[PDB]
Amino acid sequence: XASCSXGPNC
Ligand SMILES: [Cu+]
C-alpha cells in the first residue's frame, strides 16, 4: 500500500 503524505485528492 501507499498513502498521500504531502495532490488533488490527498
Ligand atoms: Cu503528495
Side-chain angles (χ1 to χ4, degrees), residues 3-7 10:
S3 61
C4 184
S5 52
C10 197

